[PDB]
């Protein structure tokens with residue numbers, strides 16, 4: 080169990096993550112009103128949420144998402160969509176760690192992700208800062224599903240400590256680095272990271288710990304089944320880097336579980 | 349609003365339909381249990397249900413589905429899969445009728461449906477009859493979603509009146525023919541036919557009345573949101589051939605609402 084307020088927060092951002100796939104904005108003009116096909120993001124629509132900046136396949140990592148202004152909830156939101164073929168993306172997924180100490184002393188992160196964000200980070204970091212200035216009392220949030228989960232975490236750890244707090248809600252995001260980094264994201268100030276996992280989902284389990292990867296604490300694990308609705312009594316906050324008894328169990332994984340984070344995600348109807 | 353019992357029957361066959369897709373049926377040993385991936389058919393798995401005859405691309409219209417024995421609910425189920433790609437299927441839908449007086453007089457049903465069914469009625473009726481025999485007490489039920497529900501209203505009135513009753517549960521099925529044929533199913537006996545519709549489902553709106561098509565009565569219409577759970581109150585009964593109030597209203601049909609009958613259907617996570 081977690082608070083209702085936190086539950087609402089998790090649901091709302093699982094929907095922002097989702098919109099990264101099912102909103103019709105691949106080229107949509109900044110200013111339009113955010114919407115999704117297949118009831119993928121209702122709480123998002125209900126709100127006065129508009130696009131500020133949309134974006135596709137950006138630079139070296141082929142990165143997509145959008146930057147929104149939510150006047151109802153007073154949010155500046157940056158969303159990272161995941162792969163358009165998550166089953167693939169999973170099979171192609173190397174476990175290569177590149178070092179990154181510009182971010183943190185000794186921290187070893189995934190080569191792939193880190194490389195992709197770093198190659199876009201400026202053109203965007205400016206864009207957030209822009210709105211933070213435009214709306215100083217608005218909370219800045221980054222969110223993402225699967226891959227997009229991985230990114231927003233990175234972009235998160237990488238942009239805080241600059242003036243405004245940056246919150247991060249990742250859904251079924253994979254490991255991003257070594258026990259150093261795990262710790263950096265576990266304690267780091269200037270924001271809070273909400274790492275949400277569903278059941279056995281197969282991504283929060285890769286790359287493996289065998290390969291030097293570790294998971295930051297804590298973990299909000301959704302116990303409810305795939306396709307089952309989520310209540311605040313179905314989430315267990317799991318404490319301690321790489322704790323078990325959450326998503327991280329020795330049991331057999333699943334790929335659908337990935338696509339069910341408080342609703343349909345990583346795919347559009 | 350339906351009774352709790354009917355609801356359970358609706359949910360059960362909605363899942364047997366999904367199972368025509370998300371099961372790992374293909375051709376697998378007769379006598380093997382039934383299971384679906386992505387929690388597409390929990391209630392079916394929950395039942396002591398096994399395959400009796402699987403078929404992949406049988407005859408003229410590459411007909412696909414399976415014949416199941418359910419000792420828990422005492423059923424002989426014949427589930428008809430819909431198209432492998434429902435967008436391309438809707439798109440290329442051919443609208444030509446063809447007589448089928450040997451089902452009923454002055455009866456013209458969609459050409460390709462009737463023709464695909466026809467090819468198999470002999471290999472199929474033979475399996476049903478075979479199972480009806482061992483399990484005389486068991487209730488025979490035909491079910492399906494989309495092109496699958498269609499093929500099941502047509503093997504429906506064709507194989508009816510032959511000793512055993514045949515119930516038909518259809519999930520967002522298209523019109524299967526001309527009005528002489530509409531009126532028939534509406535009041536044939538030795539088997540009720542529950543035609544089910546979800547909000548603005550695009551498929552039960554084809555072919556259109558314009559091309560000489562009629563929908564039978566009554567209509568069980570789920571009016572709850574796409575990806576919302578269904579309660580007993582979200583189902584409304586709709587009488588009158590080609591009546592309106594359920595799915596057959598004048599507003600934009602949605603393809604997504606076609607994929608949500610109680611549980612994700614016509615697509616597998």
Ligand SMILES: *[C@@H]1O[C@H](CO)[C@@H](O)[C@H](O)[C@H]1NC(C)=O
Nearest residue numbers: 110111112113125126127128
């Ligand atoms: C944008 O949303 C507002 C409600 O917040 C609505 O009044 C307005 O008509 C919408 N405009 C567009 C283009 O969607």
Ligand SMILES: *[C@@H]1O[C@H](CO)[C@@H](O)[C@H](O)[C@H]1NC(C)=O
Nearest residue numbers: 380381382393394395396397
């Ligand atoms: C299949 O289900 C039946 C009854 O539900 C059970 O007796 C049998 O052991 C099961 N077999 C497998 C492989 O699940």
Ligand SMILES: CCOC(=O)CC(C)=O
Nearest residue numbers: 163164165166334346617
């Ligand atoms: C098991 C296959 O699932 C997927 O890859 C889902 C998707 C469209 O991304």
